Amino acid sequence: MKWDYDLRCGEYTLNLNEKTLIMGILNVTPSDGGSYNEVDAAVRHAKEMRDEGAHIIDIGGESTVSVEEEIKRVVPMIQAVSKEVKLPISIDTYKAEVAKQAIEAGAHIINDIWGAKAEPKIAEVAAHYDVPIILMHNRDNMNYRNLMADMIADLYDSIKIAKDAGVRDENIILDPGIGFAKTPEQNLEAMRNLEQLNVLGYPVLLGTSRKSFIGHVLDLPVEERLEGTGATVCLGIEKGCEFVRVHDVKEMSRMAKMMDAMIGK
Amino acid sequence: MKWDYDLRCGEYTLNLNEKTLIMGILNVTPSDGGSYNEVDAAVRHAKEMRDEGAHIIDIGGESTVSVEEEIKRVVPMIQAVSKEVKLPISIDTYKAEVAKQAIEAGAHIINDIWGAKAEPKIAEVAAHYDVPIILMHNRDNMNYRNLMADMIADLYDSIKIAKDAGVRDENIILDPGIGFAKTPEQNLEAMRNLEQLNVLGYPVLLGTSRKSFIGHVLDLPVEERLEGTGATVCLGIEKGCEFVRVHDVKEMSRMAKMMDAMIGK
Ligand SMILES: C=C1CN=c2nc(N)[nH]c(=O)c2=N1
Ligand SMILES: C=C1CN=c2nc(N)[nH]c(=O)c2=N1
């Protein structure tokens, strides 16, 4: 057992020794906000992902708009899914106010793509509601002295803000932030040296699903990036990742399960 | 450059530093031996595999019969493919006489699933024709003292026979023999410690395509073993394999290509 604690998420509890845990991306196709077609399509997609081996559902407004409206979009979504799919929900925002709404709508984990640097006040919410927060590596420039050395550095400045906010060590997950503020070549390198994040002593989540650096290597558009995704997930798991964040849940679940058998997990 | 030599295969030459090399399994659906439907279906399958990223074609009589007839089956096959698909052909036999026929029919590499222990005389043929021979780990029992320690041992006894036969170090490839004389649990372990084969200083080829230990972990019949295969191939490549032997060439080629970008190859 590398991990002497489970991840506590209100009603559900997630073990870190047993299997690589799969986070299924829930999209958000919007058109005022909350109508039947929107929330219906979201629900059967979450249902489908539960059915195919997913352990968490990640609900994200945006991708790549009004704070007051982001809530009106995403609140109803969480209310429905948590009612209809017994599985923890994480909320993909950086905005403080948004997260508060979501946990109170039903969400269980915060997923912040700016590692509490976008709105420091987020970490406080996470602290106040006692939920597990994911801190992703990001930055508004790409001028690294040393890629990995700087990642770990910036990730620490994230932990500093989390910890000073009241966040317990046991609710902290880290993310190398594949695709964010990194060239196609830099993304390959973070993948190559992913094991280093382990020295920080926190669970690590890896999000490479369908991304464009896969496209740059394989020369293949988004709908043909399943195998390349596979590869990222397998190399990830072998380097000690605890979660992976993917679109193609069925396929990626089976690959995790093989890797798991193989590496001893 | 780990390898200071290329693999010489008559007309074609295979580099070991550039990419993980893909060996595409050619099946052999037989019904007297040599008719139009048989050799036709074999040819377009080899053509298809060339098209999808394969570097070698592996032609095998049997799977899991008369020596005089095995030749009559498999000779015409090699004659056709080498004429119609510019790509080296390996011949999946253990039998001495069979191999001689095949190289003279056109084949370029020997692939012996009994590592020259089945018919020592094979290694001599390989020596006489100067072709690269693959030596797979096998044995007619499964009583290991220490799995990996014994693998390497038995693999050496293979090299001993090869070398005493005249086989140059530069024409020797090794294979852990996944699926052969190993329990589902033992196969997981060989996968886990695949890097050890590297201490012998030879290129390594890995054959796990669609195999049943994948089935035992995932609980899935043969036609649903693509992802599990993926995983074996990726963990393989990361542990330093030079070739992989797969059925699903298109998919496995893209995964190799990702792994290759990622690990630095
Ligand atoms: C494209 C995205 C959006 N949100 C993400 N969130 C996390 N935690 N990790 C990712 O890789 C990620 N990629
Ligand atoms: C099922 C088979 C038949 N021939 C093989 N040959 C080699 N070299 N390696 C394998 O894994 C293999 N598997």
UniProtKB/TrEMBL annotation, chains A, B:
Molecular function in Gene Ontology: dihydropteroate synthase activity; metal ion binding
Cofactor: Mg(2+)
EC number, as in UniProt: 2.5.1.15
Catalytic activity: (7,8-dihydropterin-6-yl)methyl diphosphate + 4-aminobenzoate = 7,8-dihydropteroate + diphosphate
Annotated transmembrane regions: none
Presence of keyword Metal-binding: yes
Domain Pterin-binding: 20-257
Entry's Gene Ontology cellular component terms: cytosol
Superkingdom field: Bacteria
Keywords attached to this entry: Folate biosynthesis, Magnesium, Metal-binding, Transferase
InterPro entries: DHP_synth-like, DHP_synth_dom, Dihydropteroate_synth-like_sf, Pterin-binding_dom
CDD domains named in the record: DHPS
Biological process annotations from GO: folic acid biosynthetic process; tetrahydrofolate biosynthetic process
Pathway membership: Cofactor biosynthesis; tetrahydrofolate biosynthesis; 7,8-dihydrofolate from 2-amino-4-hydroxy-6-hydroxymethyl-7,8-dihydropteridine diphosphate and 4-aminobenzoate: step 1/2
Pfam annotation, one family: Pterin_bind
Family listed: Belongs to the DHPS family.
Function in brief: Catalyzes the condensation of para-aminobenzoate (pABA) with 6-hydroxymethyl-7,8-dihydropterin diphosphate (DHPt-PP) to form 7,8-dihydropteroate (H2Pte), the immediate precursor of folate derivatives.
Name of the protein described by the UniProt record: Dihydropteroate synthase
Gene: folP
